[PDB]
């Protein structure tokens, strides 16, 4: 169906069109590689206008009608949900591998042989990189923390967060540590939530081991802080899912007022009912009352008289988060409150940020919790978004470092070492596979060349100097001085990136190159 305007390609034409599309995609993010990447002005098809140098955002907002390019875009999007920091590098490496595959095909090598050779070369490069890794945790825990903080600050310094990058890195490290098991070393990003508001500056960012709920404790005169009572059993929080309203007959579920006398009598009876409910709450030992619905004026007044803060309009998921953080239980009604179900938190208090009318509250916990919120402040929505992205990058870096103590040095030094090893293997290797290995090494060489080009250095001279230094003099970690440094040899500059991150980048690039290479025909249906 829809034969009219149906796209089709031939083998000799498709094998070149795919590579041309790959090059076109690679040109999108070539300038964004490295800390010295260029900011691009993008307007999404939905009308979202922003300025950023992040490859992930560039590819997400930039859509296209080329199916081959859509493969790269989808791969980048999928990677963004994992680490996200190697998107530009992965795309560049995949483009280089595709160009090398095109060159091999022009020489008469079947695509399947090229894919197999690239897979073997990637395996060898990963093995060499692992062999050249340095174990930081097994050497010194203090150096491990220092490297974590240093990498976090290096990642943060490329964004607006540079103002409070120290606090941001501390918050990221603490958040990663709090939501992970030391032995298991598995970290779920779902355990760390991102929140923020427009206004103020990033200096007000705070790390919370619980939920905020963005509530003002109902009446403005309620206590703004509940202490643990000098080492008592924490602070008891009542979790409720019903409004604080007086019981009414089931016949009508409404109360009728005829005149002033009935008004006053009904008000007195409602006040008595509210007093009974508040006494029931107090007997349970609860200090702060949380309800899924709102509170009546009499309820708020009497709670103020009893100094019992009231939290109103809390969603079911928010109540579940409160229970998880405080290890409590959800109590249906006020009369069902009991000391065995009230949650136990370190403290609950109101935190004010500038003149924001939200007047949000903070619930803190001392033990490990499955809900951690990173609150971010900023004078503009774009500033808050950039700060949240920087926090995400720092969290990913810390997660990768804790997952595997083995780390690698950035600036392309690992790429240069892998390229040298692959070239040596290709020289040793016999058969057609030698060309594939050499092409893989040349593709690996692209990353340092691109970094040198983006940093304002002569790429031809820079790549050759790095390779010569790492080959003839000694094996070390020498990369592209993208940032202001007094010398090369990042080993002394302490530019470190996770080993598993680089391994994942290489694997994703190889898989994407194989995926694009193993597709020979493209069919696009027409439009009505």
């Amino acid at each position: 169906k829809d034969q009219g305007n149906k796209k089709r390609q031939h083998g000799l034409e498709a094998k070149k069109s795919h590579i041309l599309a790959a090059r076109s995609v690679a040109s999108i993010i070539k300038t964004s590689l490295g800390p010295r990447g260029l900011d691009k002005i993008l307007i999404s098809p939905d009308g979202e206008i922003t300025i950023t140098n992040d490859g992930a955002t560039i590819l997400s907002q930039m859509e296209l009608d080329n199916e081959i390019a859509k493969l790269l875009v989808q791969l980048s999007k999928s990677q963004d949900d994992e680490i996200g920091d190697g998107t530009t590098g992965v795309v560049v490496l995949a483009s280089a591998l595709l160009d090398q595959a095109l060159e091999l095909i022009q020489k008469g090598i079947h695509p399947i042989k090229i894919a197999n050779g690239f897979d073997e070369a990637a395996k060898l490069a990963i093995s060499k990189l692992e062999e050249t890794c340095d174990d930081i945790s097994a050497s010194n825990d203090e150096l491990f923390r220092d490297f974590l903080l240093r990498a976090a600050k290096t990642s943060l310094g490329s964004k607006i967060v540079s103002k409070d990058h120290d606090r941001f890195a501390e918050m990221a490290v603490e958040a990663v540590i709090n939501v992970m098991d030391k032995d298991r070393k598995d970290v779920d990003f779902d355990l760390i939530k991102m929140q923020g508001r427009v206004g103020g500056s990033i200096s007000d960012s705070k790390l919370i081991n619980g939920v905020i709920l963005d509530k003002d404790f109902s009446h403005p005169q309620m206590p703004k802080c509940v202490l643990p009572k000098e080492g008592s059993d924490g602070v008891k929080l009542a979790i409720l899912t019903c409004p604080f309203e007086p019981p009414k007959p089931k016949t009508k579920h409404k109360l009728d007022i005829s005149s002033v006398e009935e008004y006053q009598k009904l008000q007195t009876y409602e006040q008595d009912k509210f007093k009974e409910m508040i006494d029931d709450v107090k007997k349970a030992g609860a200090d702060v009352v949380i309800c899924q619905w709102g509170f009546d004026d009499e309820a708020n007044h009497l709670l103020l008289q009893n100094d019992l803060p009231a939290v109103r309009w809390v969603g079911g998921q928010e109540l579940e988060h409160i229970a998880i953080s405080t290890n409590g239980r959800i109590v249906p009604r006020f009369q069902d409150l009991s000391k065995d179900k009230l949650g136990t938190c370190s403290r609950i208090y109101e935190q004010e940020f500038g003149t924001t009318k939200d007047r949000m509250l903070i619930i803190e916990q001392s033990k490990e919790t499955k809900t951690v919120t990173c609150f971010v402040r900023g004078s503009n929505k774009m500033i808050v978004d950039e700060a949240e992205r920087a926090l995400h990058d720092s969290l990913c870096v810390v997660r990768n470092l804790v997952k595997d103590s083995r780390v690698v040095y950035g600036g392309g030094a690992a790429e240069v070492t892998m390229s040298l090893a692959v070239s040596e293997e290709a020289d040793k290797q016999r058969g057609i596979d030698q060309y594939a290995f050499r092409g893989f090494a040349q593709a690996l060489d692209t990353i340092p060349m691109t970094l040198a080009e983006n940093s304002g250095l002569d790429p031809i001279g820079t790549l050759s100097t790095l390779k010569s230094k790492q080959l003839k003099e000694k094996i070390s970690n020498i990369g592209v001085d993208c940032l202001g440094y007094g010398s090369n040899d990042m080993k002394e500059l302490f530019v470190v990136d996770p080993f598993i991150g680089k391994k994942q980048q290489i694997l994703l690039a190889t898989q994407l190159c194989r995926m694009i290479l193993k597709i020979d025909n493209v069919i696009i249906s027409g439009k009505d």
Partner: protein
Amino acid sequence: EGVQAFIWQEFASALEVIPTTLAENAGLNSIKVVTELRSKHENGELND
């Protein structure tokens, strides 16, 4: 080091044109002949 290394590598790669042309004109597998010659040269010298 420098541009000289790149140019020398390109010159070395280009030098293999003659054997490639000979293999193509002889009806032999172009890529396989070059690999066979390279493998054989690892043991012999100006013999194969």
